[PDB]
Amino acid sequence: SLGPQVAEGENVFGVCHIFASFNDTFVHVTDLSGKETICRVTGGMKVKADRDESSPYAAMLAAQDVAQRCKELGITALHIKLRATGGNRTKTPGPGAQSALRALARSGMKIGRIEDVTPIPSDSTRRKGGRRGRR
RNA sequence: GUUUUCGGAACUGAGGCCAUGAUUAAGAGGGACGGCCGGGGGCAUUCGUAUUGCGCCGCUAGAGGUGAAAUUCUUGGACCGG
Structure with missing residues (x-):
């Protein structure tokens, strides 16, 4: 676990994926290409309750935990990539989207480019649910 | 006996003549033509993510879904990234 670079010089960039659905969160982090992931922690592995897998808090400390994991490897600046559920379902990011990246903003990381890769x-x-919707 | 002058009837030929014969072109219609216009129609063709599945690769224990859960998937590697 050794990134070959001085600290007093430049910044090693990685890209993280915030898949903030309406029933879970993902703080998946990978390299600048994507074919090698570093650490992926979800909101569900931080609280033993289904109802708050998508809570902002369960995404707030899941963001601090992956932040410490990207410390001893040598990543200080990240790229944000939001993602809602996408597809035929919603395109508004989940309630865990706000406090996720704000937590790692106050967790020692640096921030690069922000993007919404909700797969529109x-x-x-045909979208799920009847013609009369969901009653 | 006979042809005609004779009235009547039919047909052919030359004409002369008519102020020689056809209303207008519907804020009715058809049609032609002119440059257009259009998610009109048919046949072909092309493109776009997404969805689902499969393969390979990464890292990992949860993922789903709900008002709240469970049924279901998952170290046989699911979900998530390529």
């Missing part, structure tokens, strides 16, 4: 379809398939 061109022309959707």
Whole structure:
């Protein structure tokens, strides 16, 4: 676990994926390409209750935990990439989206580029739920 | 007996003549033509993510879903990243 660079020089960049759904959160971190992930921790592995897997708090300390994991490897600046549920479902990021990256903003990391990679379809398939919706 | 002058009837030929014969072109219609216009129609063709599945690769114990859960998937590696 040794990143070959001086601290007093430049910054090693990695990209993290915030998949903040409406029933869980993901703070997946990988390298600048994506074919090698460093640490992926979810909101569900931080509280033993289903109802708050997508709470902002369960995404606040899951952000601090992955932050400490990216310390001894040599990552100080990250790239944010938001993601809602995408597809035919919603495109608004979950309630755990706000406090996630704000936690790692106050957790020693640095921030690069922000992006929303919610996989917006061109022309959707049939969305789940009846014609009368969800009653 | 006979042809006609004779009235009537039919047909052919030359004409002369008519102020020689056809209303207008519907804020009715059809049609032609002109440059257009359009998620009109048919046939073909092309493209776009997404979804689902499969393969490989990464790291890992949870993932899903709910008002709250469970059924279901998961160290046989699920979910998540490529």
